[PDB]
Amino acid sequence: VRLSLAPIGGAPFSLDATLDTVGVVDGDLLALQAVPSGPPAPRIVEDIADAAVIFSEARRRQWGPTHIARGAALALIGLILVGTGLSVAHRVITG
């Protein structure tokens, strides 16, 4: 293994350079995690333009158990509404 120090969210330190050359000020947070056997991960950033549209899809969940409820009541309402009419339109002739 190879454990070493690292500022949070960055690649670990270079083992043979003092912390004072990388710029460690008194009061940082350093992590003892392994050493990259590869690249230092420059964390490529891409720009965003309309960040509102990302959330509007998060709220817009799928079919889900929500559209079931509208189908539930809108079914139940029509059931009653024909329920009375049937019985009294039964009576609009005889009873």
Add this chain to the structure above:
Amino acid sequence: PIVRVAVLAAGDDGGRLTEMALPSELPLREILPAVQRIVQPVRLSLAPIGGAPFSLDATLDTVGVVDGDLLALQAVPSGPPAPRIVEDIADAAVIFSEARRRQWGPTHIARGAALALIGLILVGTGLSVAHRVITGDLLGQFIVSGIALATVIAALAVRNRSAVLATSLAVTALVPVAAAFALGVPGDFGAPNVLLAAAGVAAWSLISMAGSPDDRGIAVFTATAVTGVGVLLVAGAASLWVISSDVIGCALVLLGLIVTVQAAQLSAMWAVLADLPRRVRVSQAHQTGVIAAGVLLGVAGSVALVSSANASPWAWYIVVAAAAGAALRARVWDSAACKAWLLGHSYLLAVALLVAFVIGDRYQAALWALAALAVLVLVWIVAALNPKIASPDTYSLPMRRMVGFLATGLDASLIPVMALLVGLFSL
């Protein structure tokens, strides 16, 4: 114990999206200062897109971060809204009431006029036809055609001036139009008249679907068009060749399920990627309407087979089989309105039988028909309380499979039954 996540900070201009990997098992108050320097008088924090900000004390483990989710950089929730306070009850009515969007304005009048008009056309038509069907005098057909022609022009006259009234005025134009052609060579409400009308709306619709500059009114056109075309043929062949005591619907329910089972391809038949969003919905609108053509057809003759008395025990199973088939053919359809349409096929058909017997003076199957609705309503409710029988995930795989051979084992297994009712192979 590091985890790889991607944060999103968009407050300044557009937004900046980077990712990272971060040390779990800590109070987020420790790692917040770091991210604030990478991507960038208030306080900030981290939240999943679609949820509320995460506490500054919990860890990225106990707050449930999976390695690779997309967090956002939102603010600490709020403080108090600092309620106002006004003592004079007089101004307590003017102050606390502005937050309504109450102003009369010269746009509550725009919606005003059009809504008045659509009423004038509708009852303008219905009066004349009522002046034409319960009594007889053709002065209506003068007035029918008069208003029918007029609205025809107006939609074509504001195609590029309102962009919403236009598409609204088109859809209402087909009510008097279908009324007009239906009045040539009357009969007893006539045998071949229904041939003339199916030409009209299928004409009027197709002209306007392409005439729509955007969405919001496409699906209603598409569905009634195929519905007009569909009824035209099975009415035309019914006008000369076949007498078809009962087998008009045998053509319909056949044609019905045919349209429903073959639905994805038909939508494609109507077909820089910048204008992708405009193309994707129209595609969806096309599908959601086309399916309604199926159901409305599916019942269209089905309401006529079991309609009168003295029907067939094979006729009773000729409709029931179809219903279930369509009902179990929903699990393949993704959107919501797509599902509901076929799902409520039985519902729509249920009431049809009821009125049929009440208007047919039966008072026998009527009550049953009302008892055949509750059974369908009751299952809707228990589908809503617990997301268990509605969710096919807490099932078994052969159950998920058996429903398959169950599905295709019946929706098509009625064409042999179809040959019985008409007796196509009794000849």
Add this chain to the structure above:
Amino acid sequence: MTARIALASLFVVAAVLAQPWQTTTQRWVLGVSIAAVIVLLMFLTTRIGRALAMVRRNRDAHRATVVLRVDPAAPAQLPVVVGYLDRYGITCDKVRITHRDAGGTRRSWISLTVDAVDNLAALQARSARIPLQDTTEVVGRRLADHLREQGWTVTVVEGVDTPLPVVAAYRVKVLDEVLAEIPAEETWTALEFTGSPAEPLLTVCAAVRPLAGLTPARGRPALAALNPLSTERLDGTAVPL
């Protein structure tokens, strides 16, 4: 499949009513019915239409694909690539791994493709126009740098390779003895995962110039898109490993 069963049931009910199976008035059609049910029974008509379309063949921008070359590839770097099917809200359609074994060396490739209709929302945020290619490049660089993080040395590639020159198509039953088995002077093997890395699914095909459990493809389109650079879903039923 339903058209076949429905028409079969049709003819058979049509024939069973031939109690007067005589005078060749109801026996003739009886013969034609029992004859047709045979020809309707669905591995023969399929090659019929296949050969028709094949001889006819003798004359998008919703999908972009990024492909990675790593030399010392191994199944030790499998989870790192099955994870990238669904994360950062980008929902990669399918992830594909290909090896050429011509000679002794296995030339490796990762194949990543992203549609546009089921993650239209996210791409709509990067710009009003749809930056499909650039975005896919970004995820590809992310895989590159995470995989080099582990230690393997990777290379982005665009003139990737060819299993069909730009020739035997086989898709296997499902399991390991085979992929250790795979001959001739050239070997193209292609592994591909998809289907919700909560639990993924996969299909596998291989090409060289029936060994244990292979199966040919009569009717080639299946080879045309076996190269990683292809943007196609690798026809074949899926398996839960």
